[PDB]
From TrEMBL, chain A:
Top-level taxonomy: Bacteria, Bacillati, Actinomycetota, Actinomycetes, Kitasatosporales
Residues annotated for Cu(2+) 5 binding in this entry: 192, 249, 254
Protein name: Two-domain laccase
GO cellular component: plasma membrane
EC numbers for this chain: 1.10.3.2
BP-aspect Gene Ontology terms: iron ion transport
């Protein structure tokens, strides 16, 4: 259960599609757009060619954090990488391994928890597209990274989680002992503090300490702002057991207004003690 | 001194009580609540049973960050771990040491600068209870950790420090060369940036670089938001001498509105150079 | 090219606080050449800097620094009587130190890092007006052996402006593909921000560069910052992405919409920027 070495050339089709109630989402197949968009996963060294199509009546773009791209796949109107209504375009993302440069220094690799979003809808910074749902996660794995049993994306988009109505989660289910990966992206105007009851993670790339010499803070509450992204893997219920473990923004008015969800951790027999919605 | 190995079963009585000025606070003995609440110190591996009593006319709870607890000690109304008016309940916190798992991976230990607070007063997230002063620090030490000469707790609670009126500190005294530990917790609605004149610390677990290979950034200014907690140790006046050293939130309107205090570092003879209280 | 040498040199410099146009105020190293941000101060761990300070303004001003070692008498605060009356002069003394093992066996952190100085008395006793007006500037303290850049650029998010510039007027910064560029990022004022750069990423540690394969620091292209935060990093301009007009901006959506945007203009070796229309 470990990521291999990257270096594969990959292609994928992506669509921008209008969704109900003024929303917009990215999808891998027509009519399957979602908010957040599909989880794109690569190994360091992989190339991704996204054959992009804009099914909408307004221009859209695709912009990505962290990964290597040339200025033609900027996803910006300034560098003419947006997609007119009905248009098509191939965005190219590349990734690289860490390595020692010629100058002696250490080149950082592409691995990490990243994301993509629109850059042209509403404003030339994608303010309207991000608000409508044009955002999604990208995970770039380093060779040897432990692979999880499940991955869940939580996006604090302004006062919402994944553009959902207040006090509607989302909820995620796991069994005690599962290796669960959380991808956490923030968008919009507000800062947040992400908090998980009964679980904690390392404030580093993978969310797990590398070993006894990793000085990274171990936290259960992280401040984050627009376009921040981080991730972590936890063992569900580790040292704490089954239950309906709350997660929420800890800004007090934000959790009061419904930026809350449940990490529903079950015993092997499928039971969650005390849970009563 | 250094922190020893944990693994002891500890017991403590805690009370939630109404305090003067429409506030609420935790204490270890009845009639002795405080804001911030009492400092709790544990060694990785210790277990803590908190014999809790609610002396108030409203439900209250005890919820902790960082430490291990089963869901029955979650301290939320959502699964019946709150304490009714006049009720009692034992909460149990555990802690563990770091080590390796069967799957080859490293499990981080409980050590850190943590905190406890209410979760049911006002809202199902404790907004009223936190605002009223139901919060306190929890320190979990790892074996070998350097012990301080003194520990001081600074909570940025909305626009107050430790719920105090504007421009009323608190101030903390030390002697030059003392090893002083600061526990910094934030609560409420607003982000802040904690800044200390004349001192700096590492942005890691303990606030001190482990040694020459520790890449952690060394800072004197840290942004923090609701329920953030961190801590550090500094040598009072190290390389800067005695004096009235300001700490404050560096958000400009927050300092201008009184989120300011003094770290009063004394010379051995007790005096503080240039410290005219009236000019502060 | 080069690495930082060991420190330990006692340096002196004159500094002036001057009014600038548009009600602004700035620090400078020579009379009549004040700037916003103020001049870049660079030191090697162990150096001392005596700032021979002159307030040429009609209101009091001060000089307060982050991170470096200073005695209470160089606090730069009215509260500790180290401000400078109109027309007055004062010598501020900053010191730095290398890291080392203390007698008690613990490790003393060095002064090295990305720091800043600013006023502490104009407008309020916390310098709110001075900072608003532009009295801020960067300080870099290098550790022996630190990689030296080809150029250094200072970006300050001061309330809703970058370096007190009007909305949407940069600043822009030019480099050639392959250049080692150092960014100093400071934030001031009332608001939090998130600094983001297209096409480039860095390490969230002291230097912005991973020390090697065992450095666990996170690699980021987006960082939340708040008033008086400072961090810095070095990047290889266009590394793995090529030339072009690469945006940097605050990623708070209404902040980029209302002018907190700039361009990192990475040129080809022939000096051209593909697809860049000014
Ligand atoms: Cu952008
Ligand atoms: Cu929030
Ligand atoms: Cu919690
Ligand atoms: Cu972005
Ligand atoms: Cu909670
Ligand atoms: Cu504040
Ligand atoms: Cu300061
Ligand atoms: Cu909490
Ligand atoms: Cu200050
Ligand atoms: Cu901003
Ligand atoms: Cu970008
Ligand atoms: Cu400052």
């Amino acid at each position: 259960g470990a990521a291999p070495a990257g270096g594969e050339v990959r292609r994928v089709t992506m669509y921008a599609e209008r969704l109900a109630g003024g929303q917009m989402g990215y999808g891998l197949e027509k009519g399957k757009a979602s908010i957040p968009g599909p989880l794109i996963e690569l190994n360091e060294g992989d190339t991704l060619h996204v054959e992009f199509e804009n099914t909408m009546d307004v221009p859209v773009s695709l912009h990505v954090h962290g990964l290597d791209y040339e200025i033609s796949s900027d996803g910006t109107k300034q560098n003419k990488s947006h997609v007119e209504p009905g248009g098509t375009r191939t965005y190219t993302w590349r990734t690289h391994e860490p390595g020692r440069r010629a100058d002696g220094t250490w080149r950082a690799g592409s691995a990490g928890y990243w994301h993509y979003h629109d850059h042209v809808v509403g404003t030339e910074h994608g303010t309207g597209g991000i608000r409508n749902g044009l955002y999604g996660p990208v995970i770039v794995r380093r060779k040897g990274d432990v692979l999880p049993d499940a991955t869940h994306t939580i996006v604090f988009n302004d006062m919402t989680i994944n553009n959902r109505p207040a006090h509607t989660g989302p909820n995620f289910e796991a069994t005690v002992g599962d290796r669960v990966e959380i991808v956490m992206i923030t968008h919009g105007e507000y800062y947040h503090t992400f908090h998980m009851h009964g679980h904690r993670w390392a404030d580093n790339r993978t969310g797990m300490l590398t070993g006894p010499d990793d000085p990274s803070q171990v936290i259960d509450n992280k401040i984050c702002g627009p376009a921040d992204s981080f991730g972590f893997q936890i063992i569900a219920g580790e040292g704490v057991g089954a239950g309906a473990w709350m997660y929420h923004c800890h800004v007090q008015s934000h959790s009061d207004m419904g930026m809350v969800g449940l990490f529903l951790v079950k015993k092997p027999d499928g039971t969650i003690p005390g849970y009563d919605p």
